[PDB]
Ligand binder design. Sequence first.
Ligand SMILES: O=C(O)c1cc(F)cc2c1OCOC2
Lengths: 142, 140
Amino acid sequence: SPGIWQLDCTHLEGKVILVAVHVASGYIEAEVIPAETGQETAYFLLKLAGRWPVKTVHTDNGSNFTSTTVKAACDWAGIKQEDGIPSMNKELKKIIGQVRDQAEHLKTAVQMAVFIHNHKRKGGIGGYSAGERIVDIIATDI
Amino acid sequence: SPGIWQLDCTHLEGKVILVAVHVASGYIEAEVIPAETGQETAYFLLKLAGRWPVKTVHTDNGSNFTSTTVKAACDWAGIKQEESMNKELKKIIGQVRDQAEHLKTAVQMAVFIHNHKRKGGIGGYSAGERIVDIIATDIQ
Ligand SMILES: O=C(O)c1cc(F)cc2c1OCOC2
């Protein structure tokens, strides 16, 4: 449960957003990238894995993820790929829409949407944000 | 304090590596940027704050930091403005540099290596363990 991420892509304004979701908490990492190439995907994963302890990624089995470039990055990071193995994503497009007019460029609106997402309290004033849940799940001591 | 980071640039192959160190843990976040512009800095600070609860960042004197874009980004994210971990990271990028085509790749490998690495004996901890433990403890 703590090491499992789901990667998905979304296409917005003719641009591609790569989204990684930490399945257990709802916490997200996201980046606008040039196009869905093996090198861009490898580089996103290497960055994700250097920040969070990533054991397994579930992917949509796109051509970017069957490349040897991505397989190699995953081997180097000790990440197991599960390609093709099983709509928050809609609310991210929503959030991006509600910050869009404070930033000139899509990439800035994406990072603002990431911030709002990971800070939002889910389940009422009684609840926890994704950012709070992920550290809770992942922490090894107290 | 759980909320305190320090940011530093190191120049290399005619680009800039922007480094933020979570002071209490030694955990590191880093990026290779074209130059130390206010726009790059502000974008970097916004990414950091969307991922970790940043309360305060300590920085050098530079013009990037008092830029209008950086003040807007700080104000929005709720961030208040104002080394051996760095010496270590520069050492690691050196030791991996040749394993990779682009600098940005060598830098991300060094960060992975740095944040995963256990310090001390059988009962020690990595920086990525310490940051998560400090924050989780603060929440409780
Ligand atoms: O909602 C929060 O305050 C929070 C707490 C964390 F420990 C870690 C993160 C948090 O949100 C920002 O993203 C990461």
